[PDB]
Amino acid sequence: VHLTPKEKSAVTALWGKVNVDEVGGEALGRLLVVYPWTQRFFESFGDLSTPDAVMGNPKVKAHGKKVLGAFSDGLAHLDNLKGTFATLSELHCDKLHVDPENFRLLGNVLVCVLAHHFGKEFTPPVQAAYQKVVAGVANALAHKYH
Amino acid sequence: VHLTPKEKSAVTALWGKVNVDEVGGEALGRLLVVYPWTQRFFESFGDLSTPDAVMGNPKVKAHGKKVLGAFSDGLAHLDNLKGTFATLSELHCDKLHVDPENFRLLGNVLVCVLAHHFGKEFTPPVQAAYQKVVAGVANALAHKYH
Amino acid sequence: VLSPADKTNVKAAWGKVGAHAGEYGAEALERMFLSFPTTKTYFPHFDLSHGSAQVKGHGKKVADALTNAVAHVDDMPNALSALSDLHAHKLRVDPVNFKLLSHCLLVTLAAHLPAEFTPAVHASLDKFLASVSTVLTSK
Amino acid sequence: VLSPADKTNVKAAWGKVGAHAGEYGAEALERMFLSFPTTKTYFPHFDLSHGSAQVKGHGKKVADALTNAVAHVDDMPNALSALSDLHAHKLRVDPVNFKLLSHCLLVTLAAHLPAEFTPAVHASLDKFLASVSTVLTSK
Ligand code: HEM
């Protein structure tokens, strides 16, 4: 993927404002609520019986923080997503066997969460920049599948 | 993608038996019949009004021959699908704007055509080898999207 | 299939759109064109730039179709029959593209209606837009 | 939606399966497990190797469900209701996987019934399997 400088600027400036303790858990929790088959991978997380239980589940919030960290790492290496996500690809593809369509879904949930938090500041060009990013991360995470 | 020697052997041995004048046109024609939105890209080909008209259309057969040639080229370079499909990726992504899901669909139609022609010889392990191939081609053809 | 809660959630969230219906439809289209450039080729007769009167007018038509689907949510295949024929027969819209526009509609709603865009309502809206998409690709 | 020709085509092609119904269902599962290894994780209690009595028995169940759908093709959501609840609620089967199995069923039919697998019938079978898949992922 290739972001223009304008896009890179827009992405980095928004990301600096992201709450790193909460946004990842919100994206992961929404993934589990909106696409419930994904819960199959989180049996050990306990109570996922209702949307409120999912969103407030300490393990969802904690795990979501790790997810967001990887996106942050991706953001720092837009020109080497593949090496950045190498071990995570082995994990998600070879060990967990997550269908890679779900990487696309989680990236798009993250985009919805950014829109939710930033409102009008999440303009159409800002979204377009973030779509390049989340596509790039999804493609890199799926590398062990192709 | 990585084929085992057993898979490479199985793939190359079947391909040597493929009718290069007909199989590509059958795959392209079936793509147009089974997934009719794909006809949007072939307005200049004339009569596509019925399955018989599609399959017997001289331009479908001729164009399908070109498609098959690219798969043959891919088969010769399993370790460099990206460079092999470079110009085709520019064509299909940058110029034609074909959604890359359709590359997956055409590859799977090709697999059905191979099964149709080879019957019992198209065993489950032989199919699995070909699925690696057509995934590889689809991924390479989509490179300009990611 | 849409649950009773899905139907109430979608009606409630969409009800908040008010006079902005056309505006949000136009914004979702703009989001789609910029984020997913492949979709632009369906509109060679439209200028797709910001402030385009053509995109604005089209957003109103898209919104009106969604409103029709909300209002006839138990009878969507019937309510959207004409639109389904148009999108499949005449326009040959690739089914993937409905997922793209649906996503952009969710983003638009999230960006404008933060109180409405709860996790449950997000799930309901996604199911609703997927149901609309299924009808529009059914022939 | 399935056209009258789709329904006749599917009935005709499936009618040719005869006593091989279970066998072809088992073969499609095997094709899926080998071609798309991600799908294997749903069956930790089955041995997935060739000749597996468990895959054979399961192929019969899959075939019986498809036959039920063919026989009740205008009432599929109802006929497959129990199966839909199972695949979504209990098993949490990723929707992508239905496309994988559907493709493997087409391959199996093409490999066994070359006279039946015309372009038109291929199109009808694809639409039918996609309709089955929609029901099985609908909750
Ligand atoms: C952009 C997409 C994704 C990113 C960036 C991501 C990131 C991560 C990260 C950073 C971890 C922590 C690994 C560690 O402890 O070192 C993780 C673990 C995990 N992920 Fe994801 N993830 C993504 C998508 C998904 C999806 C879609 C699923 C399932 C639907 C999933 C299932 C899991 C599971 C089950 C673990 C725990 C594995 C273990 O601890 O053994 N991931 N992921």
Ligand code: HEM
């Ligand atoms: C594995 C997937 C595919 C392969 C390997 C492939 C291969 C090719 C090849 C070899 C050509 C000839 C280019 C030339 O004349 O030098 C071509 C042209 C073309 N392809 Fe494909 N194709 C694939 C998928 C598709 C799909 C899915 C579509 C549309 C649904 C499509 C639409 C076209 C069109 C419209 C042309 C003509 C472009 C022109 O002459 O200007 N292709 N393709």
Ligand code: HEM
């Ligand atoms: C939520 C999904 C969608 C809805 C509700 C929707 C609704 C509509 C409506 C109401 C119209 C005008 C109908 C008429 O004039 O009779 C229309 C036209 C059209 N739509 Fe959509 N649509 C959707 C998805 C899409 C997608 C995904 C695409 C392509 C990416 C698309 C491409 C078009 C095109 C090309 C026209 C014709 C415009 C013209 O020629 O002036 N639609 N749609």
Ligand code: HEM
């Ligand atoms: C054409 C699509 C499908 C049909 C017609 C079908 C049919 C069936 C049937 C009839 C059963 C047994 C029901 C029962 O015991 O009450 C079953 C069970 C099951 N299916 Fe499917 N299925 C389909 C797709 C899938 C897919 C794509 C997957 C996963 C990749 C899957 C995974 C399972 C699992 C894990 C079971 C339970 C087996 C056990 O625990 O013993 N199914 N299916």
